[PDB]
Amino acid sequence: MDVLTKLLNRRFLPTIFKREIAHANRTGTPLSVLIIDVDKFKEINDTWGHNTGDEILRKVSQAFYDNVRSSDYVFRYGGDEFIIVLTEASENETLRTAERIRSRVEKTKLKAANGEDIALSLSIGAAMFNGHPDYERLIQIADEALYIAKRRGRNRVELWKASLL
């Protein structure tokens, strides 16, 4: 019942992605990715301990599951990072999902071991699958979108957009 054990291990990412890209290419349905970063997680983790960090990760993971469908995939990608794969969600539906997740985490109230308010936020990079055969390319451009979100000040969603150049 620990929500964290629900998370998929990244070792399954390529297989799942290659399968969903294959499917998206034949049916022409949308496919998209959220790469999610818990803001200042490393800072919080050694300022309040590893037990606090785990609770953040539980609150954050619960937010993901409350906003996606059984057809979607939720990965633990790194220490502070997650990847959500959405299937058959339009660009707008994808952005709305990301925002529901982002707002939900921002509004979440959490206290440390000693009762102090720990402010929580997420940075999110979103990108739509555009037919490119490599799943690594879809993850790369979402990662570019996420780098933009962090550099713009965190607690936000960015959608990867092709340069008008």
Swiss-Prot record:
Q: Which residues bind substrate?
A: 45, 54
**What GO biological process terms does the UniProt entry carry, in alphabetical order?**
cell adhesion involved in single-species biofilm formation; negative regulation of bacterial-type flagellum-dependent cell motility; response to oxygen levels; response to stress
Describe the disruption phenotype. Answer: Disruption results in a 2.5-fold reduction in surface adhesion, a 3.5-fold reduction in biofilm formation, a large reduction in curli production, a drastic decrease in csgB expression (400-fold reduction in aerobic growth) and in an approximately 3.5-fold reduction in pgaA transcript levels in comparison with wild-type.
Annotated binding of Mg(2+), by residue: 37, 80
Specify the GGDEF domain's residue ranges.
29-162
**GO cellular component: a single term:** plasma membrane
Q: Alphabetically list the UniProt keywords.
A: GTP-binding, Heme, Iron, Magnesium, Metal-binding, Nucleotide-binding, Transcription, Transcription regulation, Transferase
Molecular function (GO) terms for this protein are:
carbon monoxide binding; diguanylate cyclase activity; GTP binding; heme binding; metal ion binding; oxygen binding; protein homodimerization activity
Outcome of substituting residue 69 to A: Same biofilm formation activity as wild-type
Q: What is known of its domains?
A: Is composed of an N-terminal sensory globin-fold domain that binds heme and oxygen, and a C-terminal GGDEF diguanylate cyclase domain.
What is the protein's known function? Answer: Globin-coupled heme-based oxygen sensor protein displaying diguanylate cyclase (DGC) activity in response to oxygen availability. Thus, catalyzes the synthesis of cyclic diguanylate (c-di-GMP) via the condensation of 2 GTP molecules. Is involved in the modulation of intracellular c-di-GMP levels, in association with DosP which catalyzes the degradation of c-di-GMP (PDE activity). Cyclic-di-GMP is a second messenger which controls cell surface-associated traits in bacteria.
Q: What is this protein called?
A: Diguanylate cyclase DosC
Q: Which organism is it from?
A: Escherichia coli (strain K12)
Positions spanned in the full protein: 297 to 460 of 460
